[PDB]
Design a protein around this ligand. Structure first.
Ligand SMILES: Cc1cc2nc3c(=O)[nH]c(=O)nc-3n(C[C@H](O)[C@H](O)[C@H](O)COP(=O)(O)OP(=O)(O)OC[C@H]3O[C@@H](n4cnc5c(N)ncnc54)[C@H](O)[C@@H]3O)c2cc1C
Length: 453
């Protein structure tokens, strides 16, 4: 129980009632530092722990694909916590109003939440802080090393973050203690009803193809804590060996496929790292994978935490802003609208195939995501419009979207964040370029195109 994982958001007078874990980013019962710390505080206070989750008014900004994935997981999660005699309460509405009222109505003693560096979570925290008078803590349950501990500032390159993060692994990479149940069960609607009404409100915006059939295929990723663990186990046993060599080949399914579970916190990345470390396979594949789930994932939290404008042009490095500004008035070879990008109606079949994989499976292959976002920059009127188009499509259709990895990955692609300068080109400037011919030299683009008609 390392105290460096928990931060005080507001000191107050501890009440004589239950400790409330405001679950948000880490929707799992196992390997959850936020829930474990909440249980430890409740034990010291001779009081039980409860879990509250807020179903917010912003689910209508995404799709059925993300809403169902999350709620099906929460249905399984409610059963798991019940076995630990830990009740879960699901509120519908604004977390500022709903959690303030819950704290007062249930006489909460202490409030705990998990850590997310996203703007919308900071918005909720501000409203909640002004509506309560009990202590308020946040716990980094998503990163192996607490975000505010790994670095005290924005890191501009992976190679300046990698030694810092690795130097702290011996202290923060540790096993998880078992979640102890409440001593006795203590003293707002069913999840299937909230799922039905939510789906009914999202249906007019469901992504469809010409014959009114739904585009999304929900059988690619089963949601939930139990399914995440099987995905992790299959990756280590069947795919980890070839990951180093085939991670950039979109015609092979050699990625871990963990990002939807990681995004919703249905599995702990620290759990994955522990299991990968103790697995014996190709050391280069182990190094490459750990680089992605440790360095690149946690530097994305670092990017959003230390850059208030992480989703804006202003957070790009100066060399990239000056380069993109110098080519603002370059004639673009193509300009597509948001609707043409969305439907996959560009002149590029590779880009079109990547958009179709996004539309059908909700998870674009990691390599084509780089090509996909860089062409948006190339075929947009300005870098600002490219940012907004890329964020729109990513957050609307990616199961792992609305995520620090998304804004950091898009800022890498369009603005060179966590990248370096390359040869100067028109339109794109010194931003790393990815040509259609370059992709043909790295994988069989025809198979990828044919797979997503
Ligand atoms: C334009 C763009 C948008 C992206 N949007 C998202 C997003 O919305 N959500 C998201 O989780 N990732 C995003 N990424 C990062 C990355 O593409 C995906 O995480 C990766 O493809 C996820 O599939 P996987 O779990 O099977 O990958 P794996 O290859 O098995 O890697 C495992 C984990 O390492 C992390 N990781 C891998 N690559 C990156 C990266 N470039 N940056 C940060 N973390 C990484 C992820 O957590 C990933 O789950 C984006 C990248 C780009 C270039």
């Amino acid at each position: 129980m390392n105290p460096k994982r928990i931060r005080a958001l507001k000191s107050g007078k501890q009440g004589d009632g239950p400790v409330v874990y405001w679950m948000s980013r880490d929707q799992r019962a196992e390997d959850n530092w936020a829930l474990l710390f909440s249980r430890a505080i409740a034990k010291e206070a001779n009081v039980p722990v409860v879990v509250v989750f807020c179903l917010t008014d912003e689910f209508l900004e995404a799709g059925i694909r993300q809403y169902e994935f999350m709620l099906k997981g929460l249905q399984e999660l409610e059963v798991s916590l019940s076995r630990k005699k830990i009740p879960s309460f699901f509120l519908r509405g604004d977390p500022g109003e709903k959690i303030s009222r819950f704290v007062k109505d249930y006489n909460a003693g202490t409030l705990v939440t998990d850590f997310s560096p996203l703007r919308i979570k900071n918005q909720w925290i501000e409203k909640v802080i002004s509506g309560i008078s009990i202590p308020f803590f946040e716990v980094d349950a998503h990163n192996v090393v607490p975000c505010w501990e790994a670095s005290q500032k924005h890191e501009y390159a992976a190679h300046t973050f990698r030694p810092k993060l690795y130097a702290l692994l011996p202290e923060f990479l540790e096993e998880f203690p078992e979640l102890e149940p409440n001593s006795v069960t203590p003293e707002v609607e069913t999840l299937s009803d909230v799922l039905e009404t939510g789906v009914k409100a999202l249906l007019p915006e469901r992504a469809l193809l010409k014959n009114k059939d739904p585009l999304f295929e929900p059988w690619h990723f089963e949601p939930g804590e139990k399914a995440a663990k099987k995905v992790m186990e299959s990756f280590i046993a069947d795919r980890l060996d070839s990951y180093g060599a085939l991670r950039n080949d979109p015609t092979k399914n050699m990625l871990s496929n963990l990002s939807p579970y990681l995004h919703f916190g249905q599995i702990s990345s620290q759990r994955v790292v522990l299991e990968v470390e103790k697995a014996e396979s190709n050391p280069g594949s182990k190094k490459a994978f750990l680089d992605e789930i440790l360095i690149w994932k946690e530097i994305s939290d670092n990017f959003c935490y230390y850059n208030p404008g992480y989703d804006g042009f202003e957070s790009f490095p100066s060399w990239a802003k000056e380069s993109l500004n110098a080519h603002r008035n370059d004639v673009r070879s193509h300009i597509y609208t948001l609707e043409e990008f969305e439907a996959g109606k560009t002149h590029d079949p590779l880009w079109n195939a990547s958009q179709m994989e996004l539309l059908s499976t909700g998870k674009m292959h990691g390599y084509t995501r780089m090509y996909w976002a860089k062409k948006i920059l190339e075929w947009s009127e300005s870098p600002e419009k490219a940012l907004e188009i890329a964020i729109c499509l990513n957050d609307r259709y990616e199961l792992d979207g609305r995520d620090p990895n998304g804004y950091a990955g898009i800022a890498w692609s369009i603005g060179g964040v966590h990248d370096r300068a390359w040869g100067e080109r028109e339109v794109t400037g010194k931003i790393r370029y990815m040509s259609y011919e370059g992709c043909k030299r790295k994988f069989d683009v025809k198979l990828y195109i044919e797979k997503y008609s």
